[PDB]
Design a protein around this ligand. Structure first.
Ligand code: ADP
Ligand code: ADP
Ligand code: BEF
Ligand code: MG
Ligand code: MG
Lengths: 126, 49, 42, 434, 430
């Protein structure tokens, strides 16, 4: 959800990181230039994405880490998002970190996916 | 229905990543007591004076 | 008790003037032509 | 990671729905009758029907009396107010002990109240004073979703001008209490100066005027002292008022009666809910005769809550009396109003189980021989001695890099640290009052 | 109103008597103590008479034998609008106030003064309010319309009431009250209520104020605040003399009347000798409320002195006072009292359970049974039966100890408990 992009921006500004954000609100012309700027060598360390805006077909290669806040139904598009960094222009190992809370809906979803080998989840309850 | 459960889990997911549930963190100001027990004696004091 | 903060409309509110307000209901009309012309011409 | 101080191994009484106390449950062993009586008292507290009950539990040292007093409060939950206290605390230099006791009584009983507040925030557009007297000010509060103008009380005008705000500074003002606080300059003026100390904040979300419901809890004594003396306030007048009489003073019964009347009026409308609490006094034998004499009348009050007392003494003289002797140092005219709960010493198996549980909560492993030696020591000198010696054994095991307590470690602990009996034995045969 | 859960004296209300001052065997929660009840009724009629003041009456009896109950019943039968001060003896020992000053304040708090003032006021639903700014023709013109059930007219506002009405926001259609003499504005609500008739009416307001409150008010720049904060701090004597003289003039002029209330002091036996000496003089002055005292102890040592005095009080004070003695309760009275307490607490008791409880109370004490009645009920709803049986009473009796049983157990096991010398044994073996 885009309602957490502002939260992430505020958090990074408070922590003083060199960040830069891309989403559906970003203009079309600036998108390619921003992607090129991040992919090229720079001091930017954190890059903020969106599930549907730029998590589909960009060729980001400078980064080495992927962090997921949430993934409800994730057979392929979350795999697509994590492999967006894992492109042919990458020369370093890819580390993927998933953020899941404890005793929450996401924890039960992950447990049921592990029990059912992560085929398809429609109803989650406990 | 599917819409209702979807909305409920959407609210829960909204909570999980950050307390964005409408995020009303009270400012914890003092109470708003206004009886002012002393004020009831104001008329008595004025009449006595 | 007393309200410390009150909503005020700039063009509407004015400290000079304070005004408040709340068989068939019909007001009283004077039908005297002489009275009406006296009011009009004075 | 976690800190344990002679407690926190107890989570509750651990009784059954029929009131039957399990042999081992909730960090407890034995004392089945005492736990059952305490559960009965808990049910009576939850009933809220009758106020003024007074019970005390009498037993030897290290009999779990304070453990029971903590367990009842744990069972009652954080919602019900609980006021721990010690007998020595009643002697205050500032005010007489009777006032302190009555203040604690008022603190014991709580109250839940719900209220709604009006909140205004946004970016300031103009400051227009309306000017013998301090004139009002018209404020141009502007949010991202709306804009309106408000007239402010001259006290609020003084407060906001003391914040040294200007045009374009985002401020926060509470309509109920008149609190004023400026978060910072609006983000629009961020690039105005290349180097300025003042920080910049984004525009507030939502409209300027907001309302919300809060069910915050306030004790009776809290609002009692709120009516008694002034409290904080951003104006200089509030500072003068709360600096005029800084020392606390005893409260007359007239204010208490008025507080009771207004609380009853509040509860009539259903806005407030009353939740009586429990006052706990430890080492009650330390109190004086006059304190007990006043407590006799205090317990007979209609609003006085239920108070629990604890003492470990036999035939002793009541403090302040040269000849009056009564059990537990409580005068006979008071013990009649009291209900006495006996407590009994533990056994070797109970001591061993207690040590086992204490080791488990301490995240330590003890071998069978070491555990048996600790149990024998506890049965030989005192229960508390093994619990105190537990930590040095862990330290010694850490020094020797072993991960379990052995007989050598506990023997070294015995050699290093002496109990009361060995210390007294040394004292009897000493050179110069060692 | 007057919120209260349960009191040890909640059941008793208004004592009990007849037109001939003959106590009934059971009247309004009072059982037994016929002579004591008749003496209390005599004292109550003395107080209601008001012709005689400054007399001392003492209440004596064994502990838990109708002593505080008698005072509570006397206070309840005396009714409202009559001062009644009930303070424990240990309350006067204040760190910031002298004992003599606290005693004087307690004495002054028990004499109430009624003052009557006549005021004119208008009230009703307000329908129209118009206010204009200053012009050369007129400094301020303001017209308001207050409509009642019977009347609806317009008054003219001469500046000052215009400022008063503009001080607080007032909207048409709400019930307000205006006091012409004081010039203050009172809002009675919104039109929730209904008007009654004429706007202006004649009435008098009566205020009941004690002498102590008058002294505190006249003793400071803002004395009425000290009525609640308790920081009066040794009011000067000339202030009290001036107040007494002014009260005498007011009484002779008919502007006020005095109400000689009652001062009740409990546990007087522990009061200091200086307090008794001061009371000796304070009971012989003009303005002196009736004084009743209750001491449980007998033939003990007066605090502040080495010698032992009978009843714990000096002989001269006893001469200044009249002694009333209460007798120990009997079994047939104890059972009735327990039944009344159970009715007050809404507890159902079986006949055999009641008989066993009465036997236990006779054996040990009345307070023990009056406390066991409530605790047995918790076991009662633990067994989910509304009625309390003998089994529940026996379980409560064994669970919660008595004074005698606890004393006997302490005597048997004095080794485990801490001795007076401080000796104690914690170890089990050896
Ligand atoms: N049934 C029990 N279960 C666990 N610990 C107990 C038990 N009874 C007593 N203790 C321990 O004995 C110690 C002494 O009990 P406490 O009532 O706190 O002080 P004292 O009994 O010396 O006044 C406590 O620290 C408590 O941990
Ligand atoms: N005549 C009575 N009727 C009902 N209850 C009584 C009566 N006399 C005493 N009591 C009970 O005794 C208690 C008061 O004890 P009291 O005799 O005042 O103790 P003390 O003698 O130590 O002052 C009250 O709780 C009341 O329930
Ligand atoms: F063009 Be692809 F699939 F990244
Ligand atoms: Mg203890
Ligand atoms: Mg009594």
């Amino acid at each position: 959800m885009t309602k957490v992009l502002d939260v992430l921006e505020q958090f990074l500004n408070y922590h003083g990181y060199l960040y830069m954000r891309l989403d559906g609100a970003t203009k079309i012309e600036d998108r390619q230039i921003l992607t090129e700027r991040f992919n090229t060598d720079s001091r930017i360390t954190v890059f903020i994405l969106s599930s549907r805006s730029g998590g589909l077909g960009i060729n980001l290669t400078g980064a080495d880490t992927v962090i997921f806040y949430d993934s409800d139904w994730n057979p392929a598009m979350d795999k697509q998002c994590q492999d967006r960094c894992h492109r042919i222009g990458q020369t370093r190992d890819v580390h993927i970190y998933r953020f899941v809370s404890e005793h929450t809906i996401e924890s039960n979803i992950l447990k049921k996916a592990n029990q059912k080998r992560q085929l398809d989840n429609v109803v989650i309850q406990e | 229905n599917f819409m209702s459960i979807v909305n409920c889990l959407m609210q829960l997911r909204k909570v999980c990543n950050h307390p964005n549930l409408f995020e009303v963190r009270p400012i914890l100001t003092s109470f708003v007591l206004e009886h002012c027990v002393a004020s009831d004696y104001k008329d008595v004091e004025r009449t006595l004076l | 008790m007393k309200a410390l903060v009150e909503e005020i409309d700039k063009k509407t509110y004015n400290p000079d003037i304070y005004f408040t307000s709340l068989s068939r209901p019909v007001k009283r009309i004077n039908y005297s032509l002489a009275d009406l012309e006296a009011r009009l011409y004075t | 990671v976690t800190r344990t101080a002679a407690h926190t191994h107890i989570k509750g009484l651990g009784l059954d729905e029929s009131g039957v106390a399990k042999r081992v449950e909730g960090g407890f062993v034995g004392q089945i009758e005492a736990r059952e009586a305490c559960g009965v008292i808990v049910d009576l507290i939850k009933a809220k029907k009758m106020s003024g009950r007074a019970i005390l539990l009498a037993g030897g040292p290290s009999t779990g009396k304070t453990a029971l007093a903590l367990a009842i409060s744990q069972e009652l939950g954080p919602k019900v107010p609980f006021c721990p206290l010690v007998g020595s605390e009643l002697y205050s230099v500032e005010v007489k002990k009777t006032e302190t006791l009555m203040e604690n009584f008022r603190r014991a009983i709580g109250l839940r109240i719900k209220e709604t507040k009006e909140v205004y925030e946004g970016e300031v557009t103009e400051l227009t004073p309306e000017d013998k007297t301090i004139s009002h000010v018209i404020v141009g509060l502007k949010s991202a979703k709306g804009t309106k103008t408000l007239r402010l009380d001259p006290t609020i005008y003084e407060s906001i001008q003391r914040e040294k705000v200007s045009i374009g500074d985002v401020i926060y003002i509470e309509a109920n209490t008149g609190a004023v606080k400026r978060v910072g300059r609006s983000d629009a003026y961020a690039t105005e100066f290349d180097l300025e100390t003042e920080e910049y904040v984004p525009l507030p979300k939502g409209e300027v005027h907001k309302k919300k419901e809060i069910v915050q809890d306030v004790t009776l004594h809290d609002l009692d002292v709120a009516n008694a003396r002034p409290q904080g306030g951003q104006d200089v007048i509030s500072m003068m008022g709360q600096l005029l009489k800084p020392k606390k003073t005893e409260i007359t019964e007239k204010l208490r009666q008025e507080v009771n009347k207004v609380v009853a009026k509040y509860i009539d409308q259903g806005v407030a809910e009353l939740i009586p609490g429990v006052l706990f006094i430890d080492e009650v034998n330390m109190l004086d005769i006059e304190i007990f004499t006043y407590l006799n009348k205090a317990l007979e009050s209609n609003i006085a809550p239920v108070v629990v007392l604890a003492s470990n003494r036999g035939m002793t003289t009541v403090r302040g009396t040269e000849d009056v002797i009564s059990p537990h140092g409580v005068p006979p005219d008071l013990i009649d109003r009291l209900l006495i709960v006996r407590t009994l010493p533990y056994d070797k198996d109970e001591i061993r189980t207690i040590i086992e549980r204490r080791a488990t909560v301490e995240r330590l492993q003890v071998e069978s021989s070491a555990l048996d030696l600790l149990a024998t020591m506890g049965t030989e000198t005192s229960l508390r001695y093994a619990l105190q010696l537990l930590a040095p054994c862990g330290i010694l095991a850490q020094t020797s890099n072993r991960k379990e307590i052995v007989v050598n470690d506990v023997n070294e602990a015995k050699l290093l640290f002496l109990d009361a009996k060995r210390s007294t034995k040394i004292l009897e045969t000493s050179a110069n009052y060692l | 109103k007057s919120l209260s859960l349960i009191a040890a004296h909640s059941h008793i209300t208004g004592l009990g008597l007849d037109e001939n001052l003959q106590p009934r065997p059971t009247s309004e929660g009072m059982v037994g103590q016929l002579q004591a009840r008749r003496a209390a009724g005599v004292i109550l009629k003395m107080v209601q008479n008001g012709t005689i003041a400054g007399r001392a009456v003492l209440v004596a009896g064994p502990p838990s034998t109708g002593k505080t109950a008698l005072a509570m019943g006397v206070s309840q039968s005396l009714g409202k609008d009559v001062p009644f001060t009930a303070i424990a003896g240990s309350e006067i020992f204040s760190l910031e106030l002298s004992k003599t000053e606290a005693l004087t304040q307690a004495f002054r708090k028990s004499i109430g003064i009624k003052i009557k003032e006549e005021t004119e006021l208008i009230e009703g639903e307000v329908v129209e309010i118009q206010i204009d700014r200053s012009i050369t023709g007129g400094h301020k013109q303001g017209k308001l319309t207050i409509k009642t059930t019977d009347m609806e007219t317009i008054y003219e506002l001469g500046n000052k009431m215009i400022d008063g009405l503009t001080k607080e926001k007032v909207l048409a259609g709400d019930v307000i009250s205006i006091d012409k003499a004081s010039g203050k504005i009172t809002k009675l609500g919104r039109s929730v209520q209904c008007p009654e008739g004429e706007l202006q009416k004649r009435k008098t307001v009566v205020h009941t104020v004690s002498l102590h409150e008058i002294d505190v008010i006249n003793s400071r720049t803002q004395g009425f605040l000290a009525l609640f904060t308790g920081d009066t701090g040794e009011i000067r004597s000339e202030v009290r003399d001036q107040i007494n003289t002014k009260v005498a003039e007011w009484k002779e002029e008919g502007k006020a009347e005095i109400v000689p209330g009652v001062l009740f002091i409990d546990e007087v036996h522990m009061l200091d000798i200086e307090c008794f000496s001061f009371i000796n003089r304070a009971l012989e002055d003009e303005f002196a409320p009736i004084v009743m005292m209750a001491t449980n102890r007998g033939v003990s040592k007066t605090r502040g002195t080495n010698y032992k005095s009978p009843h714990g009080l000096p002989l001269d004070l006893l001469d200044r006072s009249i002694i009333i003695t209460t007798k120990s309760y009997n079994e047939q009275e104890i059972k009735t009292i327990l039944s009344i307490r159970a009715q007050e607490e809404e507890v159902e008791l079986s006949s055999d359970a009641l008989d066993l409880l009465t036997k236990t109370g006779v054996e040990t004490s009345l307070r023990y049974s009056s406390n066991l009645i409530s605790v047995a009920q918790q076991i009662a709803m633990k067994r989910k039966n509304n009625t309390v049986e003998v089994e529940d009473v026996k379980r409560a009796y064994l669970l919660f100890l008595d004074s005698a049983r606890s004393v006997k157990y302490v005597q048997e096991n004095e080794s485990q408990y801490i001795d007076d010398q401080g000796n104690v044994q914690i170890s089990i073996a050896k």
